[PDB]
Ligand binder design. Structure first.
Ligand code: FES
Ligand code: FES
Ligand code: FES
Ligand code: FES
Ligand code: FES
Ligand code: FES
Ligand code: FES
Ligand code: FES
Ligand code: FES
Ligand code: FES
Ligand code: FES
Ligand code: FES
Lengths: 110, 110, 110, 110, 110, 110, 110, 110, 110, 110, 110, 110
């Protein structure tokens, strides 16, 4: 299913990028702002990996690189990573919908 | 309460702008894309009104005017109209969160 | 410190909004009622500025707008500005404690 | 004629002072309370202007100053500005009778 | 009541400035000439205070300053302090009418 | 003895100059502003006379002429005519004190 | 040059206000008392003209008005007209220093 | 109709922009240089307004902005504001002709 | 001058924002969609700069900030950046007309 | 070819709607603003015809009706008529590209 | 140090007066011309402030007023504000030397 | 005899009160402002003496005490010390005229 819960905002450290391999998403929290970024490389579909030390997203298939917000700056990647719809449910749980693409600037503050 | 249901997607005609006075929002449907736009003028807070013939939003207070997308072009309004988070709930009804403002180009496909 | 003096009531004009940039608060006097409003924008935390010309609060970071009482009406601000505890000390000076938030329409009559 | 319409409440911003120079009155809206104040200075009869920046009324003829409520505090003005009868008509229009002067604290809630 | 008695000429020392806080006036005696000066700052209405050593009036709100005669020289004050009507009554007591403002150069000899 | 009552403001037409020969004063009413002007010519002391047509004061002794405000403009008159203290007593009657000279711009509003 | 002669005391009539457009000052003689007053309006600097009939100074730009002593009472002028240093030279001619401003009550008797 | 008087050079402050709404022109004075600028926006013909605070011209219809000299820099305005001919009549009156458009660099020195 | 070529579509990388300082415009390519955006800040006219990492336009003068599409969100900028008419000429190279502003959502696909 | 010329701007009277059957477009002139609107009904593709008497576009197939700007308001038409790219070439004739759709608010000023 | 950097010419709007409060200077840019004006009032040394609304410099200590070019016209200020040395460094940075005063007519064009 | 010179501004240190008993005046220098104050006690005419320690003027005859500006505060002295006319002659020497008394707030800045 594209729609699913990810956890309460407390399960995510401030300034952390959490990788959900099965869900095909990153959960990026900056201060109190939350973002959901897809792991799918925009080149041919490989799974991008985040490096904490380099603070970038890197594709091991053809060397595409993305900044923390997902914008492509190196490699054959032609466009930024897809940002996904993320809401806080009525019971304090974060919900992500991979079927709903959102503009890159979208953020969820808690 | 800023969180509330708005109706099923089919209660909104294709290519129509629906004014929900009580909820102080607009529900704009273009083809199958839905947007939620606040009625509050970004100047001093008056409730703007949509003109179907002129295809623009007009404020009754000092004459600020916005395009269909919410971009301000006339009057002292310094910002575009606020776009609001709108989700499709599993019970088939559209829900709007007034407290969550979203980027201008956000859309929900059905 | 969260606790500090802001001056005597006679130092504040009737119908005035006084910005204490160091203390990061506003002192609002309407007739004989005094209010303490925090400058911290409820969006991402920037310091809002009061527009004497437009009688509203403006945040320069993302364009949030608040009414004189602190209630937001435009921009990404989700909730009204924080009102702070304000007491009249024995020595005739007004004392504000930013650590104690008070309801929106709280007021100190003198 | 001493009776005229001034518009619907939705045409007046919250916390605004509107000058109707032809009608020679002010329309003051605080929250949902409406007040009608005459522009005639109580000194020698000149037309008083409202200063949005200073939140006061000032007469250009001899320098009288009035608080936002119309009470004089500086200049040769002897008594506060006249407040006028303001009614909400059944057709949603605000009606003012400038020949009927009302007490200072009179207000119309909507 | 704006009309009130203030006292006989002998209760005010020669070359003294007497502050009537409750009456919101100054009684200035130079030799045998008496003057009644209002305490209200012509900027936004705060109560100014007289400094005998500096021989000037100072407003505690925004730093407007007035000379002994009431002429403003510092701060945003756009007008001199209001001079008030003062008479010597039948019973030898001075009466002040704050509702009657008099030109700056007015004086009462005894 | 030099203090005396002159009558109620109703006994003086608007825009009229009334000569009180036994009181050696004028009572000038413009709209609702009253002035008390001495009839003593500032040249050698003759009694000046007002012309309702020419709207000026004329001295028949040596041809000195004064404006309605008392300003000398013709003849050997060195000064303007003296303005005198005039108050509205508690019993609604106008009182003039010829022993108390006031600045030329003094006026009494009723 | 700021310093210059304006003539001998007897070249100025008693009770006269003489305008010296060449030097942009007024020479006011009341009996034997002389004053030097600048023509520059304290608002935005226009040349003020004296009306002998009204006995006031008037600015042609935005309607500021001053009394004979220079005190502002009408218009946006926030300060009285500047009074200038004036001495009686040994050779019997009056000298004015425009660069040296003096208190408003200053007078030079000859 | 296209030729009319606007007043004498003494009626315009140094470094001022004067708006003549009834005549649809601006009078700009820098030092002793006078310029006439048309208020007609070069976009679709609305009347532009001068912002004293921002030292720019603003059109309220579609948000075009012009510098003080009339050159457009923002908005759909394609060309700078029209400069109009201004002559100094030999009787001391300034005359403008809105029908005669002149280069932006032309000026009338007095 | 307002009309000029900018080059062929192949000379602009996919997902790139190229700044043409000489012509004071941006050429934005998203996939095969092209856009011409002016560099002039809609506040006071300074040249904004694009941050590839932050994916925003920033004004160096007073801190106005714009999204990739030109929508203003920070600073005193009251309107979005101007979008410009851009054509693909017959000889295969793109042409821009600075004099012709087009709606914000305009795009040229190749 | 979808890129064709239409004539000079003066070939179209002010306030006219010109239907070009062979080119499948409308040319709309309001004052000096030009628009190119496609005749294709957005329902099933019939050629829409304009009515001058009632200032609307009408599809003869199933009764779809559009406002003068192309906005659909009657019939099964789900979206407004397509607006087309229209530029003024160097040779003084307008060029239309039916293959380049533009936003509804696009206009060409001459 | 009296000599310090101010920034790049791109950081200053056209036709602007920029206040560097900590450095006690103004930076005035007209077109491509730059000038530096000291904030020290020539009266007694207080820091003057620029009024964007009135396009003048104001000193709060004794009410001195200066034109935009810095010359005094009202108040006890005896001489115009000081202009300061301003040089363009070969690394593209503007530098001001507080200790080196230059004539008002000196300008730095870029 | 009463019109005598005192010396160049060099010979008076900053913040000093120099007693000239043969000329019977004080010379007070605050920063660059000079004042000439008579030594004659307002009580009966004894020569008061300045105490650099207590920063006051004291009369040895009956205990009258003045503030540094000449304002009387102790003893039977009824009015402040006389301030005398002081001018800077073109040869760099200050000239004092004991026959010309000036307001207390008079100052001479060099
Ligand atoms: S699939 Fe990711 S870089 Fe190619
Ligand atoms: S509140 Fe909408 S234009 Fe002012
Ligand atoms: S921090 Fe205030 S609007 Fe974003
Ligand atoms: S008429 Fe208003 S102050 Fe005189
Ligand atoms: S109220 Fe007195 S200076 Fe502001
Ligand atoms: S006494 Fe009046 S003119 Fe001589
Ligand atoms: S310059 Fe004198 S009132 Fe404006
Ligand atoms: S008419 Fe001025 S911008 Fe449209
Ligand atoms: S000019 Fe761009 S923010 Fe001021
Ligand atoms: S095709 Fe036009 S109404 Fe069906
Ligand atoms: S220091 Fe500026 S006027 Fe006195
Ligand atoms: S003379 Fe000085 S106290 Fe008497």
């Amino acid at each position: 299913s594209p729609r699913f819960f990810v956890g309460e905002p407390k399960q995510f450290p401030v300034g952390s990028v959490t990788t959900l391999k099965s869900r095909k998403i990153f959960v990026v929290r900056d201060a109190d702002s939350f973002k959901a970024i897809s792991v799918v490389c925009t080149h041919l579909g490989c799974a991008v990996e985040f490096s904490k030390e380099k603070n970038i997203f890197e594709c091991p298939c053809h060397g595409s690189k993305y900044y923390r917000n997902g914008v492509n700056f190196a490699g054959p990647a032609p466009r930024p990573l897809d940002h996904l719809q993320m809401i806080l449910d009525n019971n304090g749980k974060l919900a992500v919908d991979t079927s709903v693409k959102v503009p890159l600037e979208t953020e969820l503050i808690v």
